[PDB]
């Protein structure tokens, strides 16, 4: 499959196609990484993460 259909476009969280290319984004409590794919927490206890620590 094509782009977001193929492995979520290599994005950690949200994927939407835009100008053919893929654009990744993140939920609240995260910021997109320099690679434009990974979602990095901005503080402890970001949403969606099981609090094992």
């Amino acid at each position: 499959r094509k782009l977001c259909s193929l492995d979520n476009g290599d994005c950690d969280q949200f994927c939407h196609e835009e100008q053919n290319s893929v654009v990744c984004s993140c939920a609240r409590g995260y910021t997109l990484a320099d690679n434009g794919k990974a979602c990095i927490p901005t503080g402890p206890y970001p949403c969606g993460k099981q609090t094992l620590e």
Binding site: Y45, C47, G48
Partner: protein, 234 residues
Amino acid sequence: IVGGQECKDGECPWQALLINEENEGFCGGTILSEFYILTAAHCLYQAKRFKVRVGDRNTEQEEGGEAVHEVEVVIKHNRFTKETYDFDIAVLRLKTPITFRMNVAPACLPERDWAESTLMTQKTGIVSGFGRTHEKGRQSTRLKMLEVPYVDRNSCKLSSSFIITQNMFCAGYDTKQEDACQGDSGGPHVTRFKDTYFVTGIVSWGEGCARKGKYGIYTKVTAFLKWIDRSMKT
């Protein structure tokens, strides 16, 4: 929760509990942020007044994670009707902010199209709460969880004695005796994606609990994402 497993430390940290004047837990909820809780609309007339408790894994004993919060504003969906349980969704504004810690963390709100393409298309979701352990049993003292597969919508409609609207989806098992139940009501249905849990549904109703040929019915959160986002401005 009928069957399933109990939530271990840090496994279901988005679980909230609506408690009444007598300190009894009567419904569940989902933590969305420091000020906001997602719950079912029908839960808001099973008491005259209530509070929100977070970090609770055991209702009969006290535990370090626990904190009580009072609701400032209750945002019930004006189209909710108890005849069908359609539009079974409400947002709670807390007076004071939640402190995130062990056993206390929000579930992520997904984007509308992505959720429908990517989350709804997963094999299973997870549902938790302090609800009944058998259809006719008592409330569980411990927070339990259950992995529930997404059910095909046509099969879902053919199984139901009551209408399944666009604001509802089916999850659970056909014959296997595992399902959510009374008291789990208003609680979290989340879906996992790359080690992250997104809130995909709200425990709404079912024809009893764990019955053969019957599934659990959940409020479809993706139909209300703009509405929820609008609630979190006021």
